Amino acid sequence: MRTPSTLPFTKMHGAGNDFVVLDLRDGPDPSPELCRALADRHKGVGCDLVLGIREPRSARAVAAFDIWTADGSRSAQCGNGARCVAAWAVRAGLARGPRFALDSPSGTHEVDVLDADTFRVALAVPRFAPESIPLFGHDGEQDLYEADLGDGTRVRFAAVSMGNPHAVIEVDDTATAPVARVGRAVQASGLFLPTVNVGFARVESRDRVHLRVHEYGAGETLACGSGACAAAAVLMRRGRVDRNVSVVLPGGELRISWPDDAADVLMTGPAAFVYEGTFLHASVL
Amino acid sequence: PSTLPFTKMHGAGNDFVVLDLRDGPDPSPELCRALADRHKGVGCDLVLGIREPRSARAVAAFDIWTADGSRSAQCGNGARCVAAWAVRAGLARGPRFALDSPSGTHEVDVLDADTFRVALAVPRFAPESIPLFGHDGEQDLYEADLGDGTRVRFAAVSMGNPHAVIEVDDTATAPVARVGRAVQASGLFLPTVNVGFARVESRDRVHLRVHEYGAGETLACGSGACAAAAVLMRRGRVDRNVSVVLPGGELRISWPDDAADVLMTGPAAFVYEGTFLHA
């Protein structure tokens, strides 16, 4: 039922972090050229990430997925995307049952189906040691570190690795924060790897946290799952919120659970099917 | 109804969701907004709806909705995309035909599979036709100190919609959003004026950025390109056939004589076919 010259796809999003999902089983990977075209919001389809679904690699998983950014390069992990792959897998008959595993580029992740739209994904175990983030110029683990980013920009932040590095800055109001400017400053500070994602968090209660994230490469999007998990863990590590907490992002709301310091952070949230598509003249770019 | 077939197209990066409305209701404001949402919907500058023709001449009409669900009286790049759509659907057979827009009837020449020349409108420079306020009896280059401290020298023309055309030394560094909004709020024009920032490279070539009503800048504004060309032709600065380079692509503009329609040649592209799932 696949017309030659065309590429079927599914447009999805997880809390406004949006994806072009391809079924890559028994065929090639998309070239970088094709990924770039797919992600072009005006002349292509438009998305934060291209996700390609294949047969499982691990013994237990029901499907595997790979990830491409809007410039065509591969990416090692994605938070919101995993929920969309899970929903897509359920819809395609790949994944039956309340619980199943998915292979990402970097690991195998257990998924719980909470309802048709809601999926819970184990992401990673937070690492706080300055040595594992790495947090340069710091040796003792601390709840908060302090950065002099030049006169007029003094920043107090927490630090944690979720596979990717994260700086978490508490704010009076997130809608409000110099996300792009301070996020770029922290990224260029040399306190972290240049890949650090900078979150700006406002604690509404022990149950509810508001967050914006300046992400490496993309900059800010509507939702950064890794950053949400990082903000939650940091605020839990310092006793500010409960071990189950809602994180409110521009594009949607997630529920983060971290039952034990040695356990994986769990990320619950929505997955949405937006439209089905057929990209024309897929060989002509 | 349940799901909704659509076609995604663009004209020089000005992008559209095209619906076939020939026997169904118009998209609601709510549907238009969901359709235009780039992250949680389809994503487009405008929604276009194909309808049966109104004029004796045309093979099809089309209506236009903005990303907030309100209707729009015309669109230059969209017309080329409607032309391509109409050819593909078998509505228009040979290399020329007419299309009804919400505000007129437009001759289309099919130059090749992806290239269409469309007659936009006859330029009107009379201050009372723009309408120009405060002036409204004066036809020349104008100068005005806007309410935001900027002094601007600009030409005025109506292509159906109003246009202010400002010459600059460099389109890349021009204050398109700031001065474009200043001009719209000025009261020299209806708030609906599109504000162009044009650098003349040669008599054959013009670079342009346009601050549009409502949307702000996009990758291409066809009516703005026609307005900038007609202004610079009346000002004697360019030939009656001129290329207008926009952020998303290039258009070829011709205005054979002062009573003629301005003709706008440029690309139209099909990107993908889609089924919107509502749910």
Curated annotation (Swiss-Prot), chain B:
> How is the activity of this chain controlled?
Inhibited by thiol-inactivating reagents such as iodoacetamide and Hg(2+) ions.
Give EC number(s), comma-separated: 5.1.1.19
Q: Does the keyword NAD apply?
A: no
Where can this protein be found?
Cytoplasm
Query: Where does the entry annotate site (Could be important to modulate the pK values of the two catalytic cysteine residues)?
Result: H163, E212
Residues that bind substrate, according to the entry?
N14, G76, N77, N161, N194, E212, Y213, G222, S223
Q: Which UniProt keywords apply?
A: Antibiotic biosynthesis, Cytoplasm, Isomerase
Q: Is-annotated flag, keyword Isomerase? A: yes
Q: Name one GO cellular component term.
A: cytosol
Q: Name one GO molecular function term.
A: racemase and epimerase activity, acting on amino acids and derivatives
Matching entries from PANTHER family are given as:
DIAMINOPIMELATE EPIMERASE, DIAMINOPIMELATE EPIMERASE, CHLOROPLASTIC
What's this protein's function?
A: Involved in the biosynthesis of the antibiotic D-cycloserine (DCS), a cyclic structural analog of D-alanine, used as an antitubercular agent. Catalyzes the stereoinversion of O-ureido-L-serine to O-ureido-D-serine.
Q: What else is known?
A: It employs a two-base mechanism, with a thiolate-thiol pair in the active site.
Q: Which HAMAP family match?
A: DAP_epimerase
Q: What is this protein called?
A: O-ureido-serine racemase
Write down the species.
Streptomyces lavendulae
Gene name for this UniProt entry: dcsC
